[PDB]
Amino acid sequence: ALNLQDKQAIVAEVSEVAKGALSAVVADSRGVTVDKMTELRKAGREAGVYMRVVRNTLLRRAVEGTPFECLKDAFVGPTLIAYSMEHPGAAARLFKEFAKANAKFEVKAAAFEGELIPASQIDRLATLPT
Amino acid sequence: MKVRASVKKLCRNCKIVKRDGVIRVICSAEPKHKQRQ
Amino acid sequence: MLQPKRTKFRKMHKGRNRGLAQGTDVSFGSFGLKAVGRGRLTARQIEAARRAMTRAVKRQGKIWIRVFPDKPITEKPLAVRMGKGKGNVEYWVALIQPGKVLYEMDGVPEELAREAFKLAAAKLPIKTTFVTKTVM
Amino acid sequence: QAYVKLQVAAGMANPSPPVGPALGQQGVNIMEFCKAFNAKTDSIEKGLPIPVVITVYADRSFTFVTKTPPAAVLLKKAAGIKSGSGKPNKDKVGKISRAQLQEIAQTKAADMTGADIEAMTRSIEGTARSMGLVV
Amino acid sequence: MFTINAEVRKEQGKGASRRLRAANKFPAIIYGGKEAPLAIELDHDKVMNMQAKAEFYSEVLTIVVDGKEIKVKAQDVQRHPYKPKLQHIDFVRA
RNA sequence: AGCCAGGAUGUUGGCUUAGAAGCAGCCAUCAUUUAAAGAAAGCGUAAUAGCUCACUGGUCGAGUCGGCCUGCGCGGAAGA
Ligand SMILES: [Mg+2]
Ligand SMILES: [Mg+2]
Ligand SMILES: [Mg+2]
Ligand SMILES: [Mg+2]
Ligand SMILES: [Zn+2]
């Protein structure tokens, strides 16, 4: 993450939540590769061949990289509150895959409080596709 | 317990320390690595 | 090993060992190991270092030796009283003055060349250290 | 759970003698084993094995979702010998060709996780050079 | 962008230049064409971090001596035979 | 650095392997999910099964990790 690579990362955190504006939590606390496939390969099969969640989850990697869109990002910094992005979606069906993968084989990484883009909570949101 | 005047590290857990005028080499999980200068 | 195929006359004097070097810089390849101390190199030590460094290069690249021993050192035989002449040549020695290079290498990269020259440094009586290829 | 591929030949029940009791160590029994073991292979042929995911249970009724034969052995019938590749840098024996893998990759395409064909062709060209059959 | 800041030596020769070598400096010479040989000193460690590039020996150098930015190129260099140092440089007026 | 959890498999590197699924070699080292899982740097066997290292996802509130030239010091250093 140099100057010329966090420039690409701020390009990513402009153009990645400019259209699908969701950020969330997933981290290697039940991180074993085949167990990680329960989120990763299933998100890849839900998407095309381009699945990218790729994470840079830290305290001081928040207020400098985010600040074009959704400036409530000051509650993602400490305590491993992570970075999961969806390029399409608006409280879509993938928003609760982390809740499903925590109810089934994960050990409460960072409570996954949704990062509050429609001012969400730790629960499945109401505006969910049925 | 070697005695040598050319001590070295071998594995990734060799901890050169200095106790009482002696440059000791020790390791956590190896009886053969244990040394003395 | 190396040895003269021919000397003009049989036995040479000792001389002395003053002066700086002549073959100072790297002249052929890319990497060099260069002497620092003052001393004397026999016929055996340089070919022993040649094997001990060829064993690390693993027949790759190319290496050059420049020093070649030609001084007919002698010995007086044991239990002979000191008179009655000089002695017969026992081995052939080179003279190394401070700064003279011994070997040069190309091809094989530098981080391998650190320990690949350190092994042949550890069989040599005078302290040497590494030098690089200088563009003028 | 318990996913490392090791099994026996096809048409012979009581599946010890290649491996031994390393399948039926625990309480999962031969009635549950054999009545799917030679029963599945009326859709998958005889000569090449079948990877079935074994799993140690406490409920004792083990299930089955099957898959496709492996490329540690299958490289024989796309090449032309059961055992051929002897020391392949000095005295060569075997080779593999280019385009004949659109069959092998994506005739069983729901089993493998990839839809691009040419990035999956070299993935078994590497297995040919992993058994010696250099191109 | 390679520059040189230097001044001119007082007394020349061996015994003076050895103390000038000891005091973090080293001699040079600037000759060529119409201007006479200028016999100056240089800074040692402030050009050790400049001779580490080939643009020293392939690029123009501007020396600030006598209030005159002379435009030179590197000509020849001597070195201590068993030290990582610099000894004496030539500079042509070209 | 310290406090959660990796350290895949495409894959079961294999020639015919006592056995073969990485470590006992002389076979590529590409790659599909690529944050990655080295068709592997060491344990274990009949090869192993699983847990171990980076790989990279963490946490953390002011400094750094290892090269050059030198001043000094330390061991190497057993006697009638
Ligand atoms: Mg004590
Ligand atoms: Mg001489
Ligand atoms: Mg004098
Ligand atoms: Mg006494
Ligand atoms: Zn040890």
DSSP for A71-122, please give it. Answer: --GGGSSSTT---EEESS-SS-GGGGHHHHHHHTT---SS---TT-SSS--S
Cβ contact, residue pair C34, E77, below 8 Å: no
| C-alpha span between D115 and E3 (Å, rounded) | 59
CATH of domain C21-136: 3.90.1170.10
Å from CA of B19 to ligand 1 middle = 8
Q: How far is the CA of A38 from the C1' of F5 (A)?
A: 15
| C-alpha span between C43 and C37 (Å, rounded) | 18
Å from CA of C70 to ligand 2 middle = 14
C46, C102 contact by CB (below 8 A): yes
Among chain C residues, CA nearest to E77 = C136
Backbone φ and ψ of D15, nearest 5°: -75, 50
CA distances to C96, D5, D90 from D113, rounded to whole Å, are 67, 18, 36
| C-alpha span between D14 and D4 (Å, rounded) | 20
Strand F closer than 7 A to residue A56 Cβ: yes
Which of the 76-95 residues on chain D come under 7 Å of nucleic strand F at their beta carbon? 83-89
| C-alpha span between D28 and D30 (Å, rounded) | 7
Q: How many CB atoms lie within 10 A of CB C2?
A: 14
Closest CA–CA distance from residue D115 to any residue of chain A (Å): 8
Please state the domain extents for chain E: 1-94
Q: How far is the CA of D59 from the C1' of F35 (A)?
A: 37
Q: How many CB atoms lie within 10 A of CB E21?
A: 18
Of C25, C98, C135, the CB nearest to E82: C98
CATH of domain E1-94: 2.40.240.10
Q: How many degrees, rounded to 5, is the angle at CA A123 between CA A112 and CA A119?
A: 80
**H-only helix segments in E1-94:** 14-22, 45-48
Q: Which of B10, B32, B5 is nearest to B23 (CA)?
A: B5
C41, C63 contact by CB (below 8 A): no
Pairing status of strand E88-92 against strand E25-31: parallel
| C-alpha span between C74 and C86 (Å, rounded) | 8
Q: How many CB atoms lie within 10 A of CB B7?
A: 15
The 10 Å CB-count burial string (b at 16+, else e) for E60-86 is ebebebeeeebebbbbebeeebbeeeb
C75 forms beta bridges with C88
In sign, the C-alpha dihedral spanning A64, A69, A74, A77 is negative
Resolution in A: 3.9
Neighbours of chain D (3+ CB pairs under 8 A): A
**HEC states along C9-59?**
CCCCCCCCCCCCCCCCCCCCCCEEEEECCCEEEEHHHHHHHHHHHHHHHCC
**Which tokens hold the place of E72?**
């030179």
Element (H, E) at C110: helix C110-121
Which of the 66-105 residues on chain A come under 7 Å of nucleic strand F at their beta carbon? 77-82
Please state the domain extents for chain C: 21-136
| C-alpha span between D130 and D73 (Å, rounded) | 11
| C-alpha span between C129 and C114 (Å, rounded) | 10
Strand F closer than 7 A to residue A33 Cβ: yes
| C-alpha span between B1 and B30 (Å, rounded) | 11
